[PDB]
Symmetry: C2
Subunit: 49 residues, 2 copies
């Protein structure tokens, strides 16, 4: 519980939350792209038919 250590930990937590939002964003991109791929493969099979 020291000034420098707690300041660094606070900065670390801020960066943790920011990185978490960025990781969540990447996660959302992966999810959306996955749903896109799902739709694209069903549609592509239909389109082959």
């Amino acid at each position: 519980l020291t000034k420098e250590v707690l300041g660094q930990a606070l900065i670390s937590a801020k960066n943790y939350r920011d990185q978490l939002y960025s990781f969540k964003d990447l996660f959302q991109k992966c999810l959306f792209a996955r749903k896109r791929i799902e739709d694209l493969t069903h549609r592509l099979f239909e389109m082959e038919t």
Copy 2:
């Protein structure tokens, strides 16, 4: 410009950013859904054709 008010304002800004994150999440779903509706209408004209 008072201490308590500034603490409250900091909390307000924090809640603002969090609400913004929730709003962005809903918005990105909406963006994707808008493009979905675009594609669905595209498919619907095609299917009418």
